[PDB]
Amino acid sequence: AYQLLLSKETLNKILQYKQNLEKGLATPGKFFLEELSKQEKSISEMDITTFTQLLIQSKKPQVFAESQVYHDGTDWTLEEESILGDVSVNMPVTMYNDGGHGSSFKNHPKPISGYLAYVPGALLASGSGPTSDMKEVLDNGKLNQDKLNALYERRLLPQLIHFNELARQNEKQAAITIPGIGTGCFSGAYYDVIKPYVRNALIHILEKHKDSLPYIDIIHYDPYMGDEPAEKKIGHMSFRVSPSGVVRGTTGQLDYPLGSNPDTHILVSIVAWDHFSWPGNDYWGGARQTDDGVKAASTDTMGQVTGATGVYDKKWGRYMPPESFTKDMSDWGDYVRENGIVFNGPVLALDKSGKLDTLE
Ligand SMILES: Nc1ncnc2c1ncn2[C@@H]1O[C@H](COP(=O)(O)OP(=O)(O)OC[C@H]2O[C@H](O)[C@H](O)[C@@H]2O)[C@@H](O)[C@H]1O
């Protein structure tokens, strides 16, 4: 029902980390250790896929990565955090509204079927000393455009390759909507300077891998505000920058961009996710707030992850937990605590040749 993806570089980091845990050169963080203790095998006796799944399973339904983490053995180590930020997840979804924040959403008369790809952006904020992503892309506290290009390339390429093959298997092209990933909460002190960097990072990936993405046609980038409305042609792809608060009538994220439709294109939206949380994040707590929480609440994301069938509330634009649970603490996070649900699924990685395959 959901699929975890990662780059070649991320699998090399899992491999190194697994080796170090076997050799005694590393010790696991508190939350990864808790998930290992719920299982019988040791680090040495486990395969790389089981190891990867248990590290991903340390994610909690709700965690604010920018403010609630210490980046040490008390929660998640800088090593685990390096791996976790690179993990993305995708799932097919029924989109019930266009994704408008607050009361602005428009309900789909007939729910649209598409896909969500949850990808964490550069974590450049912290309430406890520098993050793994701050160490990588910052040179003396200044944003490095080329290091940011490398980070987003590593995170977004496994999903871009995944949806390119899916659109070829469906005989359609791809229409992908992308928000201003890493430009809000995760930008920290760089809030006033980050928007051009994320837009240039997306241009860079699509310019680099255009030969590997033929069945990808529309890229609709909506950073809400702080970017000039523009149309750019990257090879065969059309990259559009249409900030909703700048360009009135902009197509919503969970809606078909202009020049795409259900018969010619498959609809994919990127979701600005968190290193340490389950896909919905804030919406596990009932709040339809961030890009992450608005997109999970506006789709059946919670139904995909928990396996339960919820009920869409047209007035609040939220996918609510089953009536049988609530009749009796009734948000989606309490549903998972009541039923013992864990975030654990299949995981694929890009190999040397640039294709997705098993981790063993
Ligand atoms: N009313 C609005 N309507 C539409 N878009 C908005 C609005 N306000 C801001 N945006 C834009 O929505 C875009 C994304 O901003 P963010 O949601 O913070 O994403 P991140 O990657 O920085 O932080 C990830 C964390 O936030 C989640 O909790 C996750 O689970 C993580 O914890 C920005 O371009 C905004 O300008």
Numbering used by the authors: 42 to 369, 373 to 404
Paper text:
The intracellular bacterial pathogen Legionella pneumophila modulates host cell functions by secreting multiple effectors with diverse biochemical activities. In particular, effectors of the SidE family interfere with host protein ubiquitination in a process that involves production of phosphoribosyl ubiquitin (PR-Ub). Here, we show that effector LnaB converts PR-Ub into ADP-ribosylated ubiquitin, which is further processed to ADP-ribose and functional ubiquitin by the (ADP-ribosyl)hydrolase MavL, thus maintaining ubiquitin homeostasis in infected cells.
To understand the catalytic mechanism of the ADP-ribosylhydrolase (ARH) activity of MavL, we screened its active truncation mutants and succeeded in solving the structure of the MavL40-404-ADPR complex at a resolution of 2.38 Å, which revealed that several pairs of hydrogen bonds and a π-π stacking interaction provided by surrounding amino acids or water molecules are involved in interactions between MavL and ADPR. The negatively charged residues D315, D323, and D333 likely form a catalytic loop (β8-α8) that directly interacts with the hydroxyl groups of ribose by hydrogen bonding. Mutational analysis indicated that all three residues are critical for the ARH activity of MavL against ADPR-Ub. Indeed, recombinant MavL effectively hydrolyzed ADPR-Ub into ADPR and ubiquitin, which is in contrast to DupA and DupB. In addition, we observed four water molecules around the ADPR moiety, two of which (H2O-1 and H2O-2) are also found in other macro domain ARHs. These two water molecules form a hydrogen bond network with the α-phosphate of ADPR and the O1” site of the distal ribose group, wherein the α-phosphate activates H2O-1 to initiate a nucleophilic attack on the O1” glycosidic bond, leading to its cleavage (middle).
